[PDB]
Amino acid sequence: PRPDWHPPWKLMRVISGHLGWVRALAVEPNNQWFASGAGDRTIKIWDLASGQLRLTLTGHISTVRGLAVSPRHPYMFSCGEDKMVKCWDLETNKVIRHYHGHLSGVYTLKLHPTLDVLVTGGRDGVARVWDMRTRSNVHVLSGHTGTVADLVCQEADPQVITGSLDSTVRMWDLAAGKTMGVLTHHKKGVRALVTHPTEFTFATASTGSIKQWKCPEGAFMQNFEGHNAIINTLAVNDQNVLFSGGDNGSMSFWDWKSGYRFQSLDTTAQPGSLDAELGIMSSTFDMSGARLITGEADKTIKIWKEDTTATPETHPIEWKPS
Amino acid sequence: NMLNLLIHRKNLTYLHLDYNFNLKPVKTLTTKERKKSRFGNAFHLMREI
Amino acid sequence: LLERWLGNLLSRQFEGRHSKGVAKTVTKQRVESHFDLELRASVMADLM
Amino acid sequence: DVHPNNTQLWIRYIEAELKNRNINHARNLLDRAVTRLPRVSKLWYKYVY
Amino acid sequence: SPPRKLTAEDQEAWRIPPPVSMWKNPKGFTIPLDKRLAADGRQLQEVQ
Amino acid sequence: TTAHRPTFDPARGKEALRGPAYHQRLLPAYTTLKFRQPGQGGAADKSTRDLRAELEAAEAAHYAKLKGAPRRWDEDVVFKNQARGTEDKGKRKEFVNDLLRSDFHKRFMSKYVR
RNA sequence: AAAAAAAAA
RNA sequence: GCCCUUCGGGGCAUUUGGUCAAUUUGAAACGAUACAGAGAAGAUUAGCAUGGCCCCUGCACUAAGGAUGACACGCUACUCAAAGAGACGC
C-alpha cells in the first residue's frame, strides 16, 4: 500500500504545574478543556486553547492513573493507585460516587460509548465492569494473569478489549462477561491499546512492537515496526495518525493504513530533570485532532501541532517497496 | 429469649443475661473468653432499648 | 440503622465471616506501605 | 496451570513420563507442548529426538 | 515472532550485580570489606 | 527472618459470590443519573474540520490577546551601593523540576529551620 | 456531660 | 347441612401438612490438665503491610483490634556442556 502524506508534528506549548508524572489526560466532548491526572495525586482542569490552569481537584491519595469525561453526562470519572474509582459531578466539582472493589491499584478506565457503563482495569489483574448509576460491579472480567494495563470500550463485539502485562490481549463479550478470544502475539507487557474511529480495527502496543488487528476476528492485519522502546501510549487521529509514545522519551508518528513511520522524535525534558526522567506517560489527541496532548515523566503537559509550512515535497514519503 | 439464644449459640454460656437485661460473666474470664465474648453495638444497643 | 446492624450481625452468625471479601481502603495507617507496594510493582513491571 | 509457558516445566514433565516408559503419555505431552509453544526450538528438538 | 538472536555480549550487558547493602543484612552474612566498600562513591568523589 | 516479605504475586480479583442475599452492603445513594442538558454542551457533534477551525480560531484569539494587537551623613560608611540588581528577581517565574532545588523548598526551609 | 491497653499435647 | 324445583332434578362447599413429643450411634463448646515464655542478623522493643483449603471480636463485605493476630524460617542434581592434555588404556 502506498502511504498518504501527513504533515510533521512540532512542539507548540509546554505546561508545567504538576508535581508528579502526568499519567492521565482526558478532553471534554466540546474540546474546551482537558484533564490531567498526575502523581501529585491531583486532577487539574486546563483550558485547551490558552493552556491556562482553570481548576485543581484533589480526591485521591495516590497517583491518578486514569480519567474520562462522559459525553452523555456532566460527570468526570477518575481512577488512581489508591484502589479507588470516583465519579465527580462537574456541576458541583465534588466526588459523588465511589466504585469500590479493586484489590490493588487501578491502572485504566474507559466508558462504554453507547450505554451507561464504566469499565476499569487493575493490578489485581482484572477488568471490572461497573454500572454508573447503581455503582454495582456487574461483571468481573477475569482470565488475565497479570496487571491489566490498558483497555478499550467499543460499540459492537468485542465490546471490551483488555491488554495486560502478562503479554496477552483478551477480547470480551460484554453481555456474558466471558472472553471470546485471546491474542498471544506480543512478547512482553501490552501497555497500550487504541481503536480506530472509522475503521473496525484496533492496535495494541508492547515493547518494540505495535500490532494492528481486525475486529471481531482478532485477525492480525499488520505490524508497526521500528519503535524499539517500551511503548506507553498510542493515539490515532481521524486522519489515520498513530502516536507511539515511549518510556525512554521516543515519539513515533505513523500512518495507520500502511504502517509507514512518517516521523520520529525525542521529546525534551524540563530544566532540572534527569536524563532518566525523559519519558512519555500519557497521550491523547483532542476531539478535533489538530492537537496532540502528551504528559511526560518530567511532570509536563506538552501540546503538539501539525506543521502547516511543510509541503508534500519538502517532506517526501521516503517509502521503499519490497 | 432472642438475646439468650444468641448468647448460647455462640457458646458464651459463662455470661448470664438476667431478666432486666444485664449481661454479667458468671465466673472469672480468661483472655480468650473475654475476647470471644466482647459483644457489639448492635447487641448492646438492642439490649438497652 | 439497628435493623441493618442486627441483620449484618445475624449474617455473620448464620452464614459466616467473609474475611477478605472486599478490598480495604488505603487509610492513613496503610499509606506508606501501600506506596511501597505500588512502587515495587511498577519498578518490577519496567524491568520485566 | 500456574506456569503454562514454562519450557523447563514442560521438559521435566515429559522426561518424568519418559523415564517410566509411558511412551503414549509422553507423546501426548509433546504434542501438547509443541502446540502450546510452537516457537520454542527445544521442545521441537526433544520431540524429533 | 521468531526469538531474538542474542550474543554473549548481550548476556554480559544484562548482568545484575549482587547487592551489598550499607544498612541491611537479613541473613546475618559476613561480607568482605572490599565488597562492602565497593558502591561507596564518597571515597572516589572529586575534591578541588 | 522471612516473616517480613515483599509481594511477588499480588492478590487476584474474584467473581462475586452467587449466594442468597441477607447481608446489607451498599446503601443506595445518587440513584438518578444526570444528563447533559441543552446548553451544557456535549450532546452535539458537528464535524471534524469545523472543530479544527474553531480550535485554531481560539488559539489565534488567545495569541492576539497575549500580544495585545487588536558633611554628607553617609561618607564614613565602608560599603556603598550593595543592593543593585537584588530587586531584579522576578523576570519570569520559572519552574525547576527539582523539589530539592525549587524556590518553594528554599522558602519553606528558610522559614522553618531557624 | 469499646478497642488498642494490660500472651500455642 | 341448607336452598331451588317443571318434582324429572339441580345448586352452594373441594385435597391441609417441615422423621412424631421421644436428647447415647448425624456431629456445639470452652474451661481444666501437664504446660507454655510475644517478631526484625548483641540487648530491650513502636508498629504498617504482604499471600490465603487460618481465622476470631466487630454494623463495618470501603473502620479498628486480636503478640506488628497467627502462619512464614523448611527443602535444594535434571533446558546442561566444550576444548586441551594425559594413561604395561581397550
Side-chain angles (χ1 to χ4, degrees), chain E residues 12-34:
Chain E
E12 290 321 289
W14 292 91
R15 296 289 270 269
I16 298 169
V20 185
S21 194
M22 298 164 60
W23 287 272
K24 293 276 176 292
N25 200 6
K27 289 179 176 290
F29 279 178
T30 291
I31 308 299
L33 281 179
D34 292 330

Side-chain angles (χ1 to χ4, degrees), chain C residues 4 20-23 27 36-39 48:
Chain C
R4 181 162 77 244
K20 268 166 144 181
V22 192
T27 74
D36 181 67
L37 280 166
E38 296 293 322
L39 175 78
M48 301 326 268

Side-chain angles (χ1 to χ4, degrees), chain D residues 10 17 23-33 47:
Chain D
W10 268 115
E17 270 202 316
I23 299 306
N24 287 11
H25 278 270
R27 269 190 288 191
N28 300 342
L29 294 201
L30 282 155
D31 279 330
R32 283 176 56 211
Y47 194 20

Side-chain angles (χ1 to χ4, degrees), chain A residues 63-305:
Chain A
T63 72
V64 181
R65 291 289 292 259
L67 275 167
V69 182
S70 183
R72 284 181 301 300
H73 318 268
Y75 294 147
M76 172 184 77
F77 297 86
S78 64
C79 71
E81 272 179 321
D82 52 329
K83 310 178 199 211
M84 281 324 317
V85 175
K86 305 182 149 114
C87 166
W88 306 73
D89 186 74
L90 292 166
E91 321 196 350
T92 49
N93 303 345
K94 284 176 182 286
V95 185
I96 64 166
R97 273 183 208 97
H98 294 310
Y99 300 87
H100 200 72
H102 273 278
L103 304 190
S104 64
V106 180
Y107 276 23
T108 182
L109 189 142
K110 291 299 171 319
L111 311 162
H112 207 285
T114 70
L115 56 84
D116 297 323
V117 169
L118 164 62
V119 189
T120 60
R123 213 171 54 83
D124 52 340
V126 66
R128 313 190 179 253
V129 175
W130 314 94
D131 183 44
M132 292 180 183
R133 203 179 45 81
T134 60
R135 314 161 285 149
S136 54
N137 202 2
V138 297
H139 276 306
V140 180
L141 317 175
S142 44
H144 282 295
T145 48
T147 304
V148 180
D150 211 339
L151 186 143
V152 289
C153 287
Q154 210 168 3
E155 73 256 20
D157 285 6
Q159 271 155 290
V160 179
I161 310 157
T162 52
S164 172
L165 289 191
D166 71 329
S167 62
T168 60
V169 163
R170 300 181 86 98
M171 325 164 273
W172 309 90
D173 173 78
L174 198 47
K178 63 150 278 180
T179 185
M180 41 173 47
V182 189
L183 320 169
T184 50
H185 293 206
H186 284 272
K187 271 158 168 198
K188 291 182 186 293
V190 181
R191 291 186 177 185
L193 282 73
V194 76
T195 293
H196 198 262
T198 77
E199 271 156 40
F200 202 43
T201 65
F202 70 100
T204 60
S206 179
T207 184
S209 79
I210 299 103
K211 307 195 179 257
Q212 191 188 85
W213 319 86
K214 194 205 163 270
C215 291
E217 311 285 30
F220 187 37
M221 298 184 26
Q222 67 166 297
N223 201 135
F224 304 87
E225 308 180 301
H227 198 156
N228 62 6
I230 298 179
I231 310 297
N232 284 323
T233 46
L234 279 188
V236 55
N237 211 323
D238 59 345
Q239 293 144 300
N240 319 290
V241 172
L242 194 56
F243 174 70
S244 293
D247 189 53
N248 70 320
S250 51
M251 312 176 68
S252 297
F253 292 95
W254 321 77
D255 165 81
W256 176 265
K257 314 162 311 163
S258 56
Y260 174 65
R261 184 155 79 158
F262 66 88
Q263 203 172 10
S264 161
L265 298 87
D266 291 331
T267 183
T268 318
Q270 285 179 174
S273 307
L274 307 187
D275 295 8
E277 271 186 90
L278 188 65
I280 297 176
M281 316 300 320
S282 44
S283 80
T284 187
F285 282 107
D286 56 347
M287 293 294 116
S288 65
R291 299 290 171 266
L292 168 77
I293 314 166
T294 63
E296 290 101 17
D298 53 301
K299 312 168 171 74
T300 301
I301 296 91
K302 293 202 183 99
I303 320 293
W304 302 86
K305 68 171 317 175

Side-chain angles (χ1 to χ4, degrees), chain F residues 7-60:
Chain F
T7 311
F8 300 139
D9 205 32
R12 320 155 64 82
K14 277 164 278 304
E15 189 71 31
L17 291 94
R18 296 258 44 76
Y22 202 76
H23 184 91
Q24 284 104 24
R25 180 177 179 269
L26 291 177
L27 303 183
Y30 302 89
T31 74
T32 308
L33 273 173
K34 307 170 90 162
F35 295 88
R36 271 170 198 268
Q37 298 297 327
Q40 310 212 116
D45 44 354
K46 55 178 72 65
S47 179
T48 58
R49 178 54 214 168
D50 308 68
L51 269 168
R52 298 172 81 104
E54 293 179 354
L55 172 62
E56 286 144 50
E59 300 203 350

Side-chain angles (χ1 to χ4, degrees), chain A residues 12-72:
Chain A
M12 183 177 176
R13 180 168 38 221
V14 167
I15 312 167
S16 309
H18 294 285
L19 286 160
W21 310 346
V22 188
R23 318 298 299 259
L25 287 174
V27 189
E28 184 182 3
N30 304 307
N31 202 105
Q32 310 291 319
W33 47 268
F34 69 95
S36 65
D40 69 327
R41 309 178 258 97
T42 63
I43 297 159
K44 289 187 194 270
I45 308 287
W46 320 81
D47 173 41
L48 199 151
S50 60
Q52 73 154 300
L53 182 45
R54 296 178 55 166
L55 182 78
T56 306
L57 299 152
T58 187
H60 283 283
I61 67 167
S62 302
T63 72
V64 181
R65 291 289 292 259
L67 275 167
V69 182
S70 183
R72 284 181 301 300

